[PDB]
Design a protein around this motif. Structure first.
Motif, short mmCIF file in Angstrom:
data_model
loop_
_atom_site.label_atom_id
_atom_site.label_comp_id
_atom_site.label_asym_id
_atom_site.label_seq_id
_atom_site.Cartn_x
_atom_site.Cartn_y
_atom_site.Cartn_z
N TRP A 21 0.82 -1.21 0.00
CA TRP A 21 0.00 0.00 0.00
C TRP A 21 0.86 1.26 0.00
O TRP A 21 0.56 2.22 -0.72
N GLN A 22 1.93 1.27 0.80
CA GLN A 22 2.80 2.44 0.87
C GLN A 22 3.38 2.78 -0.50
O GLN A 22 3.29 3.92 -0.96
N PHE A 23 4.00 1.80 -1.15
CA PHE A 23 4.64 2.08 -2.43
C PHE A 23 3.62 2.31 -3.54
O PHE A 23 3.90 3.07 -4.48
N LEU A 24 2.44 1.70 -3.45
CA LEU A 24 1.39 2.01 -4.41
C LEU A 24 0.96 3.47 -4.31
O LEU A 24 0.81 4.15 -5.33
N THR A 25 0.78 3.97 -3.08
CA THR A 25 0.46 5.38 -2.91
C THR A 25 1.60 6.26 -3.40
O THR A 25 1.38 7.28 -4.07
N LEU A 26 2.84 5.87 -3.08
CA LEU A 26 4.00 6.64 -3.52
C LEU A 26 4.03 6.78 -5.04
O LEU A 26 4.25 7.88 -5.56
N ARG A 27 3.79 5.68 -5.76
CA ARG A 27 3.79 5.76 -7.22
C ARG A 27 2.56 6.51 -7.73
O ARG A 27 2.64 7.18 -8.77
N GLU A 28 1.43 6.42 -7.02
CA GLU A 28 0.24 7.17 -7.40
C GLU A 28 0.45 8.67 -7.25
O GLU A 28 -0.22 9.45 -7.94
N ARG A 29 1.37 9.09 -6.39
CA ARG A 29 1.66 10.50 -6.19
C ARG A 29 2.96 10.94 -6.87
O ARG A 29 3.53 11.97 -6.49
N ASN A 30 3.43 10.17 -7.85
CA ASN A 30 4.61 10.53 -8.66
C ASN A 30 5.86 10.67 -7.80
O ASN A 30 6.63 11.62 -7.95
N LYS A 31 6.07 9.72 -6.89
CA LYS A 31 7.27 9.69 -6.07
C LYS A 31 8.25 8.62 -6.49
O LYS A 31 9.46 8.79 -6.32
N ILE A 32 7.77 7.51 -7.04
CA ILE A 32 8.61 6.46 -7.59
C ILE A 32 8.70 6.68 -9.09
O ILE A 32 7.69 6.96 -9.75
N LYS A 33 9.91 6.55 -9.64
CA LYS A 33 10.11 6.77 -11.07
C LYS A 33 11.01 5.68 -11.64
O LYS A 33 11.99 5.29 -11.01
N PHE A 34 10.66 5.20 -12.83
CA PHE A 34 11.47 4.23 -13.55
C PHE A 34 12.38 4.96 -14.52
O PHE A 34 11.91 5.75 -15.34
N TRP A 92 -6.40 0.20 3.77
CA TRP A 92 -5.31 0.95 4.40
C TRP A 92 -5.56 2.45 4.31
O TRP A 92 -5.25 3.19 5.25
N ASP A 93 -6.10 2.92 3.18
CA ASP A 93 -6.43 4.34 3.06
C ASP A 93 -7.40 4.77 4.15
O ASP A 93 -7.22 5.80 4.80
N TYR A 94 -8.45 3.97 4.38
CA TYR A 94 -9.42 4.29 5.42
C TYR A 94 -8.78 4.24 6.80
O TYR A 94 -9.12 5.05 7.67
N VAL A 95 -7.86 3.31 7.02
CA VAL A 95 -7.23 3.18 8.34
C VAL A 95 -6.33 4.38 8.63
O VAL A 95 -6.35 4.92 9.74
N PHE A 96 -5.54 4.81 7.65
CA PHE A 96 -4.49 5.80 7.91
C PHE A 96 -4.80 7.20 7.41
O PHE A 96 -4.15 8.15 7.87
N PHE A 97 -5.75 7.37 6.50
CA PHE A 97 -6.20 8.69 6.09
C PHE A 97 -7.52 8.98 6.79
O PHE A 97 -8.49 8.23 6.65
N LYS A 98 -7.55 10.07 7.57
CA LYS A 98 -8.76 10.42 8.32
C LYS A 98 -9.92 10.72 7.38
O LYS A 98 -11.06 10.32 7.65
N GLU A 99 -9.66 11.42 6.28
CA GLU A 99 -10.69 11.83 5.34
C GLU A 99 -10.90 10.82 4.21
O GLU A 99 -11.43 11.19 3.16
N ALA A 100 -10.51 9.56 4.41
CA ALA A 100 -10.72 8.56 3.37
C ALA A 100 -12.09 7.90 3.52
O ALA A 100 -12.54 7.65 4.65
N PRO A 101 -12.76 7.62 2.41
CA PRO A 101 -14.08 6.99 2.48
C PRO A 101 -14.00 5.51 2.80
O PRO A 101 -13.04 4.82 2.46
N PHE A 102 -15.03 5.04 3.48
CA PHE A 102 -15.12 3.63 3.85
C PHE A 102 -15.36 2.78 2.61
O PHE A 102 -16.41 2.93 1.97
N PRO A 103 -14.43 1.91 2.22
CA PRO A 103 -14.61 1.13 0.98
C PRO A 103 -15.45 -0.12 1.19
O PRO A 103 -15.87 -0.43 2.31
N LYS A 104 -15.69 -0.86 0.10
CA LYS A 104 -16.51 -2.07 0.14
C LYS A 104 -15.61 -3.26 0.43
O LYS A 104 -14.90 -3.75 -0.45
N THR A 105 -15.65 -3.73 1.67
CA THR A 105 -14.89 -4.90 2.08
C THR A 105 -15.73 -5.71 3.06
O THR A 105 -16.56 -5.16 3.78
N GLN A 106 -15.51 -7.03 3.07
CA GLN A 106 -16.25 -7.91 3.96
C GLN A 106 -15.93 -7.69 5.43
O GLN A 106 -16.57 -8.30 6.28
#
Ligand SMILES: CCOc1ccc(Cl)c2c1[B@-]1(O[C@@H]3[C@H](O1)[C@@H](COP(=O)([O-])[O-])O[C@H]3n1cnc3c(N)ncnc31)O[C@@H]2CN
Ligand SMILES: CC(C)C[C@H](N)C(=O)NS(=O)(=O)OC[C@H]1O[C@@H](n2cnc3c(N)ncnc32)[C@H](O)[C@@H]1O
Length: 1003
Positions: A177-190, A592-606
């Protein structure tokens, strides 16, 4: 010996008690209900499990251990979690090195190592084979670290412990989750970048997989290609029809207009190899290796060599060089050429390089060097220096002038050539002015990169990257600088860097030196290669063929600390049942977004909403990280990446960025570098076995509270063990004779003295704990506490007071509890306390009376003086004389000192001015000899004990102080009577020389 074992017995008993009581386990669902005095979140950078934990790790974590121990007494709720870092390549490397001898030989192996180091650790013959696989390391070492730490008694919630490789599913999902967010925010580069690279490992060689040059990075060289012209030298006859170049390395391309020849070392092994387009380069094996890993060859890491030769075999060859005004220049020898720097080929700039004109003058001087190496007269004589750069204070021929001035006549003058080199060292970078056409009158700093580009565009130069300093990896491989493709974290983005600079402004560094270290590593940092292919760790979730290095999966795991107790529940590998019933794979990116981001929406999980709300509660309650203690070796790498990743992960919430970071030096053992090769080396379990946990922690508290290297001394630990045993025996004795103690109102002089000293100790020790100066805390809250108690026992002629001794024991235990919690818990139960000492509160200091303390110091000094005078002239009756005021001359001189002190904010003039002013006063005729010693004593005691020595009368009753302890004075001096009188009764000598505070005596 039995004292250490008694300590260990008490320690094991109290540790089992704590374990069953589950005292140091904390839950946010319950702690958030009773609002107290806040939370305190401390972390220790989880250590590598390629072995056992030793004394440096324990010293570094002792800071936050003692910090938790203190801060819990101030009411806060403490979170001290402990993880174990298995990600990296040394573990897998050692497992494979062991498997090598397992398969190629036998058990035991026949020689002519790794099996030797494993057997040295006390492993059975049949149990070392299991260590051929890394999973056995992961099953073996982490539990031993946990066992040793629990045996030390750390105030750690072990439910929050975990493992860091993909073997752990929950930590794996977290890093995903950490590195996925990092790449989603243009922090990891190939991209394809330059990096220190290990050929034997086949991946970049960062800071924690090196063995030499911890922070050394690549260095750039302008690589000139000088074409070899026919007739070729003899040894190259077999390479006719092809293109042959000498590749010289340089750092000052703008000078190449003044080339006269080219220097090679005649006794060096040079290699001619084939490049990417079929040409032949002549350098060294190491230069060729680096170029081959920089794309200079057809295949990466393959150097097709077509000729080997010596420098003498090249001497005399004809070259055509770029820029220079000489159309054909020749190859000539030079004795002083380093084999570690460059390509072994050097260009000749005799106008602005001292070594070049030195060697050229040596060749122009005698025919011995010309005939020894075969140099005729066309290769040296018709070549003169070419004016290219002019330094204002030297001229167009700077090297010529400064070598004529320093009177040098050889190329082997290391001192004189180094001096001439440093004299014009940088005066060419800035103040030089070009002279060649196309650049006349230009700032050298304004044209050097342009001329470099000029040479690179015409195919006459290239860029060569070589290690600045020699680097060696963990696998005994000499590293290169490779221009290879990888994923990197973009720590060079100006926005990211400025935001982290603000975060550094907000961060608490306990000294300015650490802030400077951070500023330097922040201004120096750029791209960070984070991708490996060989080792343990977590794979990139989108490029399953790359793993993530150790210095990149460790940036924000403290957030995983806040939920690791509810995810995997103490099972290190995360293979056991989940307490909240959450499967390992059910943790997706949005969860993980919901757990660690206060303003994250509750996703669809069992997952039920209560579990994830409890997780979010734990995180938002415990965060941010209040304190992180580490060694000063992790500032240039780990801690900066930590700040960067906290900035990037919570960019809108500066209140979740780290608060404080305290760094310490590295631990010395008995004032020597701690190493297994030299003999002095203690692992944590060895140290416990030798000194007990409390003795070890005590000697660790006294080690060092600065960033200078810390000192652990064995003798100090042994003395601390002795003192702890005597203290416990004293407490037992006092509890035994509870009824043999004076009671009622504690009104005696020494009772008040000791009460004030106890309270002042409480205040000083509270202060020293707030500053995390644990050495000073131990000084003021134990050694000096005990010194005050010993003085109180010695002076209490009527016996010690009951409530006062009970209070001293209670408070001394409450002060020592952060250092020695086992002994303090034992003495707490010895006093008949209802609850554990882990529920106690910080003791409240009463009133502190400076007058009493100063009077007690006075009495100490008087008794010391009396015992010293007892040495000489059988005694039986003593008489002491005490002055109520200073005699007239002393009073006048002290009034002058008071006037001058009052004049200019408390600075006393030089004794010359003082002696002048006192010699101008007529009353001071019979006393000028005695005057200046008085001023000297006054200045000494002013520097020693404040300005109160400038008082014309003591703040307390001197005679009464002596009378309150006449009994003790008579007893300890072995006398029959002491007569205290008021100085006016004495004879002339004493009445004239006696002054208040310095009473005189006669037997
Ligand atoms: C600092 C003096 O360097 C000067 C000073 C003035 C001028 Cl005009 C120049 C250089 B310099 O020559 C190369 C290169 O730049 C420089 C590289 O410095 P560093 O010792 O390898 O760290 O030393 C020289 N060098 C490179 N490889 C070398 C080697 N293996 N052995 C000895 N010297 C070497 O370039 C021009 C022409 N010589
Ligand atoms: C988060 C991750 C990237 C870090 C990585 N896992 C890691 O560094 N693991 S470790 O075992 O080498 O050290 C862990 C902690 O213990 C301190 N320390 C270690 N040796 C000594 C010594 N001889 N003297 C004094 N302190 C020492 C050291 O600074 C650090 O804070």
């Amino acid at each position: 010996t039995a004292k250490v074992d008694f300590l260990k017995k008490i320690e094991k008993e109290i540790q089992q008690k704590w374990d069953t009581e589950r005292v140091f386990e904390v839950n946010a669902s319950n702690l958030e209900k009773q609002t107290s005095k806040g939370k305190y979140f401390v972390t220790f950078p989880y250590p590598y499990m390629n072995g056992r934990l030793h004394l440096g790790h324990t010293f570094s974590l002792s800071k936050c251990e003692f910090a938790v121990g203190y801060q819990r007494l101030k009411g806060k709720c403490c979170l001290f979690p402990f993880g174990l870092h298995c990600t990296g390549m040394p573990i897998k490397a050692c497992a494979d090195k062991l498997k090598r001898e397992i398969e190629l030989y036998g058990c035991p192996p026949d020689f002519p190592y790794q099996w030797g180091i494993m057997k040295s650790l006390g492993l059975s013959d049949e149990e070392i084979v299991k260590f051929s696989e890394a999973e056995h390391w992961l099953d073996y070492f982490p539990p031993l670290a946990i066992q040793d730490l629990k045996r030390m008694g750390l105030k750690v919630d072990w439910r929050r412990s975990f493992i860091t490789t993909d073997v752990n599913p929950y930590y794996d999902s977290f890093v995903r989750w950490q590195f996925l967010t990092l790449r989603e925010r243009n922090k990891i580069k190939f991209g394809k970048r330059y990096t220190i690279y290990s050929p034997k490992d086949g991946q970049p060689c960062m800071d924690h997989d090196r063995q030499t040059g911890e922070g050394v990075g690549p260095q750039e060289y302008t690589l000139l290609k000088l074409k070899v012209l026919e007739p070729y030298p003899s040894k190259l006859s077999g390479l006719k029809g092809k293109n042959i170049f000498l590749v010289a390395a340089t750092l000052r391309p703008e000078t190449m207009f003044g080339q006269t020849n080219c220097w090679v070392r005649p006794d060096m092994k040079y290699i001619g190899f084939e490049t990417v387009n079929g040409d032949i380069f002549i350098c060294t094996q190491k230069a060729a290796r680096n170029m081959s890993y920089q794309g200079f060859t057809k295949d990466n890491g393959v150097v097709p060599v077509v000729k080997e030769l010596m420098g003498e075999e090249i001497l005399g060859a004809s070259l055509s060089a770029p820029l220079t005004s000489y159309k054909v220049i020749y190859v000539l020898p030079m004795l002083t050429i380093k084999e570690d720097k460059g390509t072994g080929v050097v260009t000749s700039v005799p106008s602005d390089s001292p070594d070049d004109i030195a060697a050229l003058r040596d060749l122009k001087k005698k025919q011995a060097l010309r005939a020894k190496y075969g140099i005729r007269d066309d290769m040296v004589l018709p070549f003169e220096p070419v004016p290219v750069i002019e330094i204002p204070g030297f001229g167009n021929l700077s090297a010529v002038t400064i070598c004529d001035e320093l009177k040098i006549q050889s190329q082997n003058d290391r001192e004189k050539l180094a001096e001439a080199k440093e004299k014009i060292y940088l005066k060419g970078f800035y103040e030089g002015i070009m002279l060649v056409d196309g650049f006349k009158g230009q700032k050298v700093q304004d044209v050097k990169k342009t001329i470099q580009k000029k040479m690179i565009d015409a195919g006459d130069a290239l860029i060569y990257m070589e290690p600045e300093k020699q680097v060696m990896s963990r696998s005994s491989d000499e590293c290169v600088v490779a221009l290879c493709d990888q994923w990197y974290l973009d720590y060079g983005e100006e926005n990211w860097k400025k935001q982290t600079s603000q975060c550094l402004k907000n961060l608490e560094t306990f000294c300015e030196e650490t802030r400077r270290n951070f500023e330097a590593t922040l201004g120096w940092l750029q791209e960070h290669a984070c991708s490996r292919t060989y080792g343990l760790g977590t794979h990139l979730p989108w490029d399953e063929q790359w793993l993530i290095e150790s210095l990149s999966d460790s940036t924000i795991y403290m957030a995983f600390y806040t939920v690791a107790h509810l995810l995997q529940g103490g099972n290190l590998h995360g293979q056991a049942e989940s307490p909240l019933g959450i499967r390992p794979q059910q943790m997706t990116k949005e969860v993980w977004d919901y757990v660690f981001f206060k303003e994250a929406p509750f996703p669809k999980t069992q997952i039920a909403k209560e579990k994830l709300d409890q997780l979010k509660q734990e995180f938002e309650f415990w965060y941010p990280v209040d304190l992180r203690v580490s060694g000063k070796d992790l500032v240039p790498n780990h801690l900066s990446y930590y700040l960067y990743n906290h900035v990037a992960m919570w960019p809108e919430q500066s209140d979740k960025w780290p608060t404080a970071v305290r760094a310490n030096g590295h631990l010395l053992l008995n004032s020597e570098k701690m190493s297994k090769s030299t003999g002095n080396f203690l692992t944590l379990t060895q140290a416990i076995d030798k000194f007990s946990a409390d003795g070890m922690r005590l000697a660790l508290a006294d080690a060092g509270d600065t960033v200078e290297d810390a000192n652990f001394v064995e003798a100090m630990a042994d003395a601390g063990i002795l003192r702890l045993y005597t203290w416990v025996e004293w407490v037992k004795e006092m509890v035994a004779n509870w009824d043999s103690l004076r009671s009622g109102p504690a009104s005696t002089f020494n009772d008040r003295v000791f009460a004030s000293e106890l309270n002042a100790g409480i205040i000083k020790t509270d202060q020293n704990y707030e500053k995390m100066m644990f050495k000073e805390a131990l000084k003021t809250g134990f050694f000096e506490f005990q010194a005050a108690k010993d003085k109180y026992r010695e002076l209490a002629v009527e016996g010690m007071h009951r409530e006062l001794v009970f209070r001293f024991i209670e408070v001394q235990t409450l002060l020592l509890a952060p250092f020695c919690p086992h002994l303090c818990e034992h003495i707490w139960t010895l006093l008949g306390k209802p609850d554990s000492i882990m529920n106690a509160s910080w003791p409240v200091a009463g009133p502190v009376n400076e007058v009493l303390i100063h009077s007690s110091q006075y009495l100490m000094e008087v008794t010391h003086d009396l015992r010293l005078r007892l040495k000489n002239y059988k005694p039986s009756h003593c008489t002491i004389y005490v002055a109520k005021n200073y005699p007239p001359w002393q009073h006048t001189t002290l009034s002058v000192l008071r006037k001058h002190f009052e004049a200019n904010n408390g600075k006393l003039p030089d004794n010359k001015v003082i002696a002048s002013e006192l010699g101008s006063m007529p009353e001071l005729k019979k006393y000028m000899k005695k005057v200046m010693p008085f001023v000297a004593m006054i200045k000494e005691n002013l520097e020693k004990m404040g300005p109160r020595i400038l008082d014309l009368q003591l703040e307390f009753d001197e005679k009464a102080v002596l009378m309150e302890n006449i009994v003790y004075l008579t007893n300890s001096l072995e006398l029959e009577h002491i007569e205290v009188k008021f100085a006016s009764e004495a004879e002339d000598k004493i009445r004239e020389d006696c002054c208040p505070g310095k009473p005189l005596n006669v037997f």
